[PDB]
Design a protein around this ligand. Structure first.
Ligand SMILES: NC(=O)C1=CN([C@@H]2O[C@H](COP(=O)(O)OP(=O)(O)OC[C@H]3O[C@@H](n4cnc5c(N)ncnc54)[C@H](O)[C@@H]3O)[C@@H](O)[C@H]2O)C=CC1
Ligand SMILES: Cc1cc2nc3c(=O)[nH]c(=O)nc-3n(C[C@H](O)[C@H](O)[C@H](O)COP(=O)(O)O)c2cc1C
Ligand code: SF4
Ligand code: FES
Lengths: 62, 217, 433
């Protein structure tokens, strides 16, 4: 079986914002690394572009 | 019923990429005429005719013919495969000299297409998906060939034989197996979709040009 | 007395397709002797706006089955160009069971279709016309090609068409055995060398169509009456039929009638009048009639009690919980297994589905299995309501109207012949103990 010796291997906390998590980590004395939130960028979707007269976006199959 | 045909190709000595296929020079001129019917930069629109032309030269479509069409039209072979497996008129297995197609849809069924089908089966000694041992006839069932008024009807090699009785189709098969050319059309003594009762309309002589023209034109 | 209240008894002088039966020469000389290609130059010189106005006044609705107003639909191409060519596509697929009207137009009156292509393309500012015909119509397509060659040699189409200074080409493309390719976007995809799978709308074809260009898809019968409409005027066409149901119509009467036939008749003619006058009546008398499918396989059937007074127009048949469709009247007498005929239609739709979208691809096959069991009576009565719900799930949730056309006949059968289904199930449960 898989054995461990650190008691915090299953500790995961949930926070509403990054600032709340940072404050909680700071008051508990834990050194922290913060990674910024990644949001997918908005994209331009056009169904008609599938059938373009002169562009490469024309599809060869459906 | 569920289609007994398969939509995956497995290479066979009778059907593989090394199977010899090539268009004849006359067919290459025909392909040139076909391709010139579409705008520049849209060559793939010629996939359906050119593929069909290959069948008209070969009788059926071995995978080498599909690859040849794809090479000629600069089209990926998978697109040609999609076209060949989507449309039912393409023969991906060899068929007999005379491909008999019997419409069994409801308007033709109401006019006893079953009798025609059983007459064909008995006259040829095969079933609705088989080929005769002499490779002269193949029989299948098709959907609504578009002559429901002339039901029941049968298509043989892009010819229509309509207003059929079992004796009519047996005579047609007898004429076909003797090498003759049976005349397409109805067999009831009626030329076309007209009423058999005596032409209930269009009895008067057709009017001339400009008879109903409005003013100012 | 204006505002005709009885419709029918159409005269030969008012009929449009005068060579319906091919008793006269279908070549160019015979068509010209019958009134075709007469003053086409003056029609083209009147301008697109005048032609579109004539079509709008005519009240012509789409003869392909949906009945969309033709003038409004053709007006969508009256926009200025944006650098792309413009195209007219003529729909000659004719896949609907019980419908053979287009075939007769192509084989016996091809010059009417060609002149209609020219006039409609001028109205829509279209450079050329592509005629898509089903591949089974090989001889019809060859006759059409011969007529097109005759028009090219006579200068009627091509460069400087009819001397009007407008260049127009007519191309014939043949399909290969696919009923779905009669759907306009599936037809456009088929022309471009792809599988005949319909496109989602929007964009509509007038924005993005064949080769990505502005395109109008129009039924052959719709195209072939436009030159006559322009010549005789919109008003003449308008007088026939009820209001908003104008003009004449080609009817194909098949099934259990004495003389199955294709005829031309006024729009709002009663169904009984049509059947008893032109088709010779129902086999075994009118009292032998069991059911009628009035507008091709996609329209729901109506029992005898409804067929006695119903009129053959869009609005009346809509009120009768059915449709005018292609005006293909399939008659079934009392000797018909009504469940088996509808099961055969469902099997047709199962074999014609393109398979692109989930509701059609799965539910049409599911309904086919359920109907095959219903024919034997293997099921339970509760499943009937289940089947109804399945149809409702399929209807309105599919990319194209093939799902509608598969759901509607089942709904008609359940609406009018539920006792037959329950009675068959009772027999099956009895005999199998
Ligand atoms: N002639 C034949 O052999 C067959 C005929 N049909 C008939 O086709 C009918 C349904 O076909 P659909 O095309 O799906 O009906 P639809 O109502 O969606 O379209 C009818 C025509 O009007 C146009 N249109 C409709 N709404 C539009 C809008 N908001 N803007 C611009 N254009 C618009 C469409 O582009 C189309 O050309 C069925 O009722 C059936 O009877 C079906 C199969 C075969
Ligand atoms: C499954 C399906 C098949 C169709 N087949 C045909 C056909 O064979 N011929 C036709 O004219 N219209 C057919 N239509 C209707 C066309 O999509 C389109 O509405 C019509 O061609 C428009 O022409 P119109 O406005 O002149 O009627 C079909 C529609 C569907 C959903
Ligand atoms: S409804 Fe049927 S035919 Fe139409 S797109 Fe969907 S799967 Fe294809
Ligand atoms: S039902 Fe047989 S041709 Fe249409």
């Amino acid at each position: 079986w898989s054995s461990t010796a650190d008691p915090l291997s299953n500790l995961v906390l949930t926070f509403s914002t990054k600032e709340d998590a940072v404050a909680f980590a700071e008051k508990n004395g834990w050194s922290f690394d913060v990674e910024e939130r990644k949001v997918p960028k908005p994209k331009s979707k056009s169904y008609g572009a599938n059938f373009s007269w002169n562009k490469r976006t024309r599809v060869s199959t459906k | 019923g569920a289609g007994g045909a398969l939509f995956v190709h497995r290479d066979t000595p009778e059907n593989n990429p090394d199977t010899p296929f090539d268009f004849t020079p006359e067919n290459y001129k025909r392909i040139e005429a076909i391709v010139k019917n579409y705008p520049e930069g849209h060559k793939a629109a010629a996939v359906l005719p050119v593929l069909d032309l290959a069948q008209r030269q070969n009788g059926w479509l071995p995978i080498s013919a599909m690859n040849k069409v794809a090479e000629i039209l600069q089209v990926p072979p998978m697109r040609v495969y999609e076209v060949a497996t989507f449309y039912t008129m393409y023969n991906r297995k060899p068929v007999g000299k005379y491909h008999i197609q019997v419409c069994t849809t409801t308007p033709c069924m109401l006019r006893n297409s079953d009798s025609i089908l059983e007459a064909i089966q008995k006259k040829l000694g095969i079933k609705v998906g088989e080929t005769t041992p002499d490779k002269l006839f193949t029989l299948i069932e098709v959907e609504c060939l578009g002559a429901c008024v002339n039901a029941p009807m049968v298509q043989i090699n892009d010819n229509y034989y309509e207003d059929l009785t079992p004796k009519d189709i047996e005579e047609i098969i007898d004429e076909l197996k003797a090498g003759k050319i049976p005349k397409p059309g109805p067999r009831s003594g009626r030329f076309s979709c007209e009423p058999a009762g005596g032409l209930t309309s269009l009895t008067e002589p057709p009017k001339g040009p400009g008879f109903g023209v409005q003013a100012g034109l | 007395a204006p505002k005709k209240t009885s419709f029918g008894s159409l005269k030969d002088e008012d009929r449009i397709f005068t060579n319906l039966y091919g008793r006269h020469d279908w070549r160019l000389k015979g068509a010209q002797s019958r009134g075709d290609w007469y003053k086409t130059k003056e029609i083209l010189l009147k301008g697109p706006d005048w032609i579109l106005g004539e079509v709008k006044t005519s009240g012509l609705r789409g003869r392909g089955g949906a009945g969309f107003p033709t003038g409004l639909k053709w007006s969508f191409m009256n926009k200025p160009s944006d650098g792309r060519p413009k195209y007219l596509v003529v729909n000659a697929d004719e896949g609907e069971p019980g419908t053979c009207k287009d075939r007769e137009i192509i084989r016996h009156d091809p010059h009417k279709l060609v002149e209609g292509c020219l006039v409609g393309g001028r109205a829509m500012g279209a450079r050329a016309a592509y005629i898509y015909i089903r591949g089974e119509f090989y001889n019809e397509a060859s006759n059409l090609q011969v007529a097109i060659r005759e028009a090219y040699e006579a200068g009627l189409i091509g460069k400087n068409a009819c001397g009007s200074g407008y260049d127009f080409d007519v191309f014939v493309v043949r399909g290969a055995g696919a009923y779905i390719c009669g759907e306009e976007t599936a037809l456009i995809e088929s022309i471009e060398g792809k599988q005949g799978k319909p496109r989602l709308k929007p964009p509509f074809p007038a924005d993005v169509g064949v080769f990505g260009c502005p395109t109008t898809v129009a039924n052959v019968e719709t195209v072939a009456v436009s030159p006559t409409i322009c010549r005789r005027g919109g008003a003449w066409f308008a007088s026939f039929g009820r209001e908003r149901n104008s003009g004449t119509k080609l009817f194909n009467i098949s099934g259990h009638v004495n003389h199955p036939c294709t005829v031309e008749e006024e729009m709002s003619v009663p169904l009984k009048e049509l059947i008893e006058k032109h088709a010779g009546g129902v086999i075994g008398g009118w009292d032998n009639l069991l059911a009628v499918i009035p507008g091709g396989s996609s329209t729901p059937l109506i029992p005898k009690s409804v067929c006695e007074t119903v009129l053959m127009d869009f609005d009346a048949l809509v009120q009768a919980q059915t449709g005018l469709g292609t005006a293909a009247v399939i008659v079934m007498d009392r000797s018909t297994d009504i469940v088996k005929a509808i099961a055969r239609l469902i099997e047709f739709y199962k074999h014609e589905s393109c398979g692109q979208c989930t509701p059609c691809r799965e539910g049409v096959d599911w309904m086919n299995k359920v109907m095959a069991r219903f024919v034997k009576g293997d099921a339970r009565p509760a499943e009937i309501d289940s089947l109804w719900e399945i149809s409702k799930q399929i209807e309105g949730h599919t990319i194209c109207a093939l799902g509608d056309g598969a759901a509607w006949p089942v709904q008609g059968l359940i609406r009018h012949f539920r006792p037959e289904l329950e009675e068959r199930m009772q027999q099956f449960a009895l005999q199998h103990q």
